[PDB]
Amino acid sequence: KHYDYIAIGGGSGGIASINRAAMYGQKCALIEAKELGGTCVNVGCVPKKVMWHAAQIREAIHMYGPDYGFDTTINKFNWETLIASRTAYIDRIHTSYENVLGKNNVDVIKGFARFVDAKTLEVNGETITADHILIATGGRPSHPDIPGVEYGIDSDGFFALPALPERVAVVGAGYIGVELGGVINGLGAKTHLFEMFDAPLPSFDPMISETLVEVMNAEGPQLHTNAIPKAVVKNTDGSLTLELEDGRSETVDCLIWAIGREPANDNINLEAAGVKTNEKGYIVVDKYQNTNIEGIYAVGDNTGAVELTPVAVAAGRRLSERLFNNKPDEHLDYSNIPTVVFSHPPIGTVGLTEPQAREQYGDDQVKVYKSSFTAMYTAVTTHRQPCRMKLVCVGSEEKIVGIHGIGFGMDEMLQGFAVALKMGATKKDFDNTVAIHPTAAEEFVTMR
Amino acid sequence: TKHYDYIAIGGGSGGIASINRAAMYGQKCALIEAKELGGTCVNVGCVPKKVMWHAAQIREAIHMYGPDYGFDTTINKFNWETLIASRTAYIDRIHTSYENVLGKNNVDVIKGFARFVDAKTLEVNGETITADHILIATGGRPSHPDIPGVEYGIDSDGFFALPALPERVAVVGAGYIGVELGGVINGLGAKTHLFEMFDAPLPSFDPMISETLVEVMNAEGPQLHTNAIPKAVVKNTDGSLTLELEDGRSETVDCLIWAIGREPANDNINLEAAGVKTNEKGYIVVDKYQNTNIEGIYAVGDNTGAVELTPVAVAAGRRLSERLFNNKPDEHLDYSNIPTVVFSHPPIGTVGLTEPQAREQYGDDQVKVYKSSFTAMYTAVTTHRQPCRMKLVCVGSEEKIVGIHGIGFGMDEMLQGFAVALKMGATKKDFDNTVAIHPTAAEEFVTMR
Ligand SMILES: Cc1cc2nc3c(=O)[nH]c(=O)nc-3n(C[C@H](O)[C@H](O)[C@H](O)COP(=O)(O)OP(=O)(O)OC[C@H]3O[C@@H](n4cnc5c(N)ncnc54)[C@H](O)[C@@H]3O)c2cc1C
Ligand SMILES: Cc1cc2nc3c(=O)[nH]c(=O)nc-3n(C[C@H](O)[C@H](O)[C@H](O)COP(=O)(O)OP(=O)(O)OC[C@H]3O[C@@H](n4cnc5c(N)ncnc54)[C@H](O)[C@@H]3O)c2cc1C
């Protein structure tokens, strides 16, 4: 069969690019080996956020509810009910995705695709060819090469758990490990988070790492830094003992590897098409998402770019604008991409951290405004939680180049502030907007 | 007589904001407050309302959403006294923070009720004090209907004084205060009725917001009764109350809260001795720079009839002290594109023109509206799914954004940043060019098509 455009991978980048191309009169096919929606819908963004909301309910019942006057007994936490509700939601999302590709007349092929040559793919015995092929294959969890690595699960296995284990160790502490440790701790398991560096989230602004250590020490999970796994022993009673290079050990019922992800570019015969990958296995692309082979493009996690769904969606849509709607310079600017981490409490960040701004512009040019306060939701309780915010400004005009915050509300407040930073907001622009009270967000327009 | 550079009558949102800013420039100041520091917002407004809204959110999490997430829970006891004690201790700590800052700024705080003796002299507690500049920031108070039985109803101040939660509650007025209270009391478990005089609640807001609110109340409570014109309140033998309406409907409840409006507190301070003019509704008339008709007397806040929000009184109060005492002769507050969040169930966020307003102003042919409707993810895995609806109102070829409106979970924290972008002259292209944050409610505004 011949197509104008084929996308390999029905995830975030693949679906977004193919739907936009289909709007410009291109005949398109989408190939997906597993479930529509990719990592984000099935084992990523969406089930993570449902589990985060379940942890927030249990914390409202058990931790904050008593000081608001609610004496409550959780008679039973039915794990199966929560998984059933979450799974039915993902099933309705699958049906909405099929409907959109359908109305767009996109051919969806369920199967694993491999290249035959630069223009030809084989999927399920059949060969298909196209003049434009997008590789959007995403990535997969990495696992350490250590004795006993197979007794641990990774984030995909977390979403398949049949019950909540009593004692859990999460190894990594990049944003996925921090998010899962916060959710599992919040749902009531005795939880340990092992971070290999001396601080969780080390590339984030230091205000964020320092505040996360504080709430973890007060509320769990139990943080262990400078922790490099050496081995995992399975014990006769069934439990697992994690052994660290430095000598520490911990016995738990479940161990989750959250050390990193690697690109799924390996079993699709890229060598035949001639596409170059780098040392880490990522497909090398230029600013326009072109590979080294004319007619083959890549977007998403398999390119080594920041691993976020909106980034794969915008790069995929802009690619179809460039190819099919005559916009030859259309492309995604990868700077100032906003990120929210659904930790406890959530983190929101966009732009340069204060060290970054200072290295790039010199201390002389950098003015930082900071706010620290207690989240109002928690202020009436014995479980007060900090909220800390930072604006990083440069020059006499105080152009805002970085906005960072950790606390309740950070997840929903950051989007409009990232529009404003994209428009080139200065501190004066923030200060001339009237505050909304009482919110955590108004702290960013009343900093002094 | 003691003489000050600047005196503020009213230690609420406007008064504290303006006096602290003047004190920072070396002005010797006095602040007069008859009751508690912080005014309506700290004591019977913004702050206690939001603590009660968090309490309703926790009860809904336990009772309404929790079961579908797998939590089988028994509320063994809801101790109203614990909640009120926690709420009150927090407001007390805020009282202390304000005294600390006022003390650091060397402001003399005078506790009592002030009245004008003439245009530059005030009397408080028998003492007479004078100043070159006097700010009147006296706020407002709950209005009450003139009908038989009005005295059996309480108002929003009385709601914050309740000794216990009543079993059946009627809130009359579905302006934003009645809508908030109706949703909080219903969320805490009481049988709640909300009576609206017109066809829909929040009649001044964009129709998309009024419509979604009706749909939510129909499904979840409070019970809405529109075209409800109060005739009388009858107290029954057993002590319950029956609200009688003009059209013949009636409703028996244990507690009835009037939330029909607020009027200015400008009437007992002998404004006529100073010569300050008020309008027909009793508000002090001010120009662009908050000047009254008497040189040296200014007014800010709810008593001027400007939009009744704490941030507006704070910003107008600070910019008035900048103008008077820091040589910014043109400093003043722009009253357009002020953002509002209503802490209803679900919350509402709006800034700029409603779609009707934009169409009258620019004409139909110039207006382009984008809308998004979806289910809040928090509720989407339960049997109590709740709508989220958002609207962008754009004008002209460039699609300059002139209104941003939404109702749904997340609206309370997401609006501030979009209001900054609106003030910056954002067009829909500026929203579209920003990468989304997933999964959030807020990303819907930068992905509308
Ligand atoms: C636990 C977790 C939480 C996350 N949470 C968030 C979050 O909250 N917000 C956020 O923005 N990002 C989040 N991410 C990141 C987000 O999931 C990814 O960045 C996004 O899914 C990447 O899109 P993609 O198109 O590159 O690949 P993917 O979405 O991974 O999709 C690739 C698709 O390709 C298919 N495939 C692979 N090879 C073939 C083949 N040869 N033939 C056919 N089909 C094939 C796969 O089956 C898969 O469906 C999270 C990731 C994880 C693991
Ligand atoms: C139930 C409710 C909820 C609200 N929720 C919000 C919200 O969440 N967000 C928001 O932005 N706004 C909210 N508001 C509105 C906000 O409370 C007001 O807009 C704001 O308080 C007005 O500030 P002000 O300075 O004009 O007056 P006020 O805060 O009312 O203060 C005026 C002060 O003057 C004192 N006073 C009066 N006369 C004299 C006298 N002659 N001598 C001495 N002292 C005197 C009064 O005791 C009072 O303390 C709410 C209002 C109510 C009633």
Pairing, β A126-135 against β A120-123: antiparallel
Q: Is B204 helix (H, G, I), strand (E, B) or coil?
A: coil
For residue A329, the tally of other CB atoms under 10 A from its CB is 7
Nearest CA to ligand 1 atom 33: A9
- The method of structure determination was X-ray
B317 and B386 inside one domain: no
Q: What is the Cα–Cα distance from A332 to B434, expressed in whole angstroms? A: 10
Out of B310, B320, B350, B415, mutate this one to test ligand 2's pocket (max ligand atoms within 8 Å of CB): namely B310
Residues B60 and B151 in one domain: no
Question: Residue B346, preceding bond cis, omega within 30 degrees?
Answer: yes
Task: Among B83, B341, B431, select the one facing A436 at the smallest CB separation.
Answer: B341
The C-alpha atoms of residue A368 and residue A391 are separated, in whole angstroms, by 6
Residue A377 and residue A439 in one domain: yes
The two tokens of residue A97 are: 């995705």
Confirm or reject: Cβ of A187 under 6 Å from ligand 1: no
**Distance (Å) from the C-alpha of residue B173 to the closest C-alpha of chain A?**
22
Are residues A423 and B416, on separate chains, in Cβ contact within 8 Å?
A: no
Query: How many degrees, rounded to 5, is the angle at CA B426 between CA B420 and CA B432?
Result: 110
Distance between CA atoms of B389 and B376, rounded to whole angstroms? Answer: 9
| Cα B182 to Cα B176: distance, rounded to the nearest angstrom | 10
Contact A415 B418 (CB under 8 A): yes
Contact list, A80 vs chain B (CB under 8 Å): 70
The DSSP string of B93-144 is HHHHHHHHHHHHTTPEEEES--EEEETTEEEETTEEEEEEEEEE---EEE--
**DSSP letters for A139-182:** EEE----STTGGGSB-HHHHTT-SS--SEEEEEE-SHHHHHHHH
Which ligand ends up closest to the CA of A439? 2
Number of Cβ within a 10 Å radius of residue B449 = 5
Per-residue DSSP letter, B379: H
Residue A445 is part of a domain; what is its CATH number?
3.30.390.30
First to last CA, chain B: 66
Residue B175's SS3 state is coil
φ/ψ of A253, rounded to 5, equals -95, -25
Is residue B160 lining ligand 2, measured as CB closer than 6 Å? no
Indicate whether A394 and A324 sit together in one domain: no
- Could B440 and A340 be called an inter-chain contact, meaning their C-beta atoms sit closer than 8 Å? yes
DSSP 3-state of A214 = helix
Inter-residue contact B383 to B68 (CB < 8 Å): yes
Rounded CA gap, A253 and A182, in Å?
Answer: 17
Q: How far apart are CA A335 and CA A434, in angstroms?
A: 28
Q: For the residues of B299-315, what is the DSSP string, one character each?
A: E-SGGGTS---HHHHHH
Contact A346, A340 (CB under 8 A): yes
Are residues B62 and B37 part of one domain?
A: yes
On whether both B23 and B138 belong to a single domain, the answer is: yes
Best substitution site from A309, A317, A341, A410 to test ligand 1's pocket, by max atoms within 8 Å of Cβ?
A309
The half-sphere exposure of B133 on its side-chain side, counting CA atoms within 13 A, is 20
- Distance, CA A33 to ligand 1 centroid (Å)? 12
Radius of gyration of chain A (CA): 24
Asked if A208 and A406 touch (Cβ cutoff 8 Å), the reply is yes
- Look up B225 and say whether it is catalytic: no
Closest alpha carbon within chain B to A331: B433
A378 lines ligand 1 (CB under 6 A): no
Among the three residues B336, B364, B380, which one is the final residue of a domain in this structure? Answer: B336
Integer angstrom CA distances of residue B230 from A214, B146, B150, B167, B233: 55, 10, 10, 21, 8
CATH classification of the domain holding B331: 3.50.50.60
Contact indicator for A54, A350 with CB cutoff of 8 Å: no
- Nearest by CB to residue B378, choosing from A46, A53, A440, is A53
CB contact under 8 A, B416 and A417: yes
How far is the first Cα of chain A from the last one, in angstroms, to the nearest whole number?
64
How long is chain B? 449
| Ligand 2 neighbourhood includes B297 CB (under 6 angstroms) | no
**Full domain range(s) for residue A393:** 336-448
Q: What are phi and psi of B80, to 5 degrees?
A: -55, -35
Per-residue tokens: B126 = 């028998």
Cross-chain CB nearest to B435 (options A50, A64, A337): A337
Which of A69, A311, A413 minimises the CB distance to B83? A69
**Residue A129 carries which DSSP code?**
E
Separation CA A62–CA A51 (nearest Å): 16
Chain A residue whose CA is closest to B313: A434
Under 8 Å between Cβ of B301 and B321:
no
Distance from the Cα of A265 to chain B's closest Cα (Å) equals 25
Give me B223's structure tokens.
């019970």
In short, whether A178's Cβ falls inside 6 Å of ligand 1 is no
Cis, bond preceding B311 (omega within 30 deg of 0): no
Question: Are A268 and A330 in a shared domain?
Answer: yes
For residue B29 the two structure tokens come to: 């100041």
Dihedral angle, C-alpha A35, A39, A44, A46, nearest 10 °: -50
Q: How many domains does chain A have?
A: 3
- What is the rounded CA–CA span in Å between residue B291 and residue A360? 47
Shortest-distance Cα residue to atom 23 of ligand 1: A12
Return the structure tokens found at B61.
């999490």
Which residues from B are below 8 Å from A417, CB to CB? 416-417, 420
- Does residue B65 share a domain with residue B53? yes
State if residue A154 touches ligand 1 by the CB under 6 angstroms criterion.
Answer: no
The length of chain A in residues reads 448
> Minimal Cα distance from A315: which residue of B?
B435
Handedness of CA A261, A266, A268, A272 (dihedral sign): positive
B378 contacts on A by Cβ (under 8 Å): 53
- Same domain (yes/no): A24, A122: yes
What backbone torsions phi and psi does residue B286 show, to the nearest 5 degrees?
Answer: -125, 155
Domain end call among A284, A317, A335: A335
CA of A430 to the centre of ligand 1 (A): 35
* Structure tokens that stand for B294 in this block: 């008497």
CA A43-A45-A47 angle, to 5 degrees, is: 55
CA distances from B61 to A60, A179, B68, B83, B223 (A): 7, 21, 10, 17, 21
Nearest CB neighbour to A45, from listed B82, B83, B438: B438
The rounded Å distance from CA B250 to ligand 1 centre is 58
CB atoms < 10 A from the CB of B292, how many?
A: 24
Angle at A79 between CA A74 and CA A81, to 5 degrees: 95
Q: Are residues B81 and B134 in the same domain?
A: yes
What was the resolution (in A) of this experimentally determined structure? Answer: 1.7
Which residues contact residue A9 at a Cβ distance below 8 angstroms, ignoring those fewer than 6 apart? A31, A32, A38, A134, A135, A136, A137, A138, A300, A302
Nearest-angstrom CA–CA distance, A249 and A263: 31
Final residue of a domain: which of B287, B311, B336? B336
Q: What distance in angstroms lies between residue A26's CA and the mean position of ligand 1's atoms?
A: 25
Residues B351 and B444 in one domain: yes
Q: Are residues B230 and B269 in the same domain?
A: no
DSSP summary character for residue B154: B
Q: Measured between alpha carbons, how far is B280 from B305 in angstroms, rounded to an integer?
A: 11
A-chain residues within 8 Å CB-CB of B101?
A: none
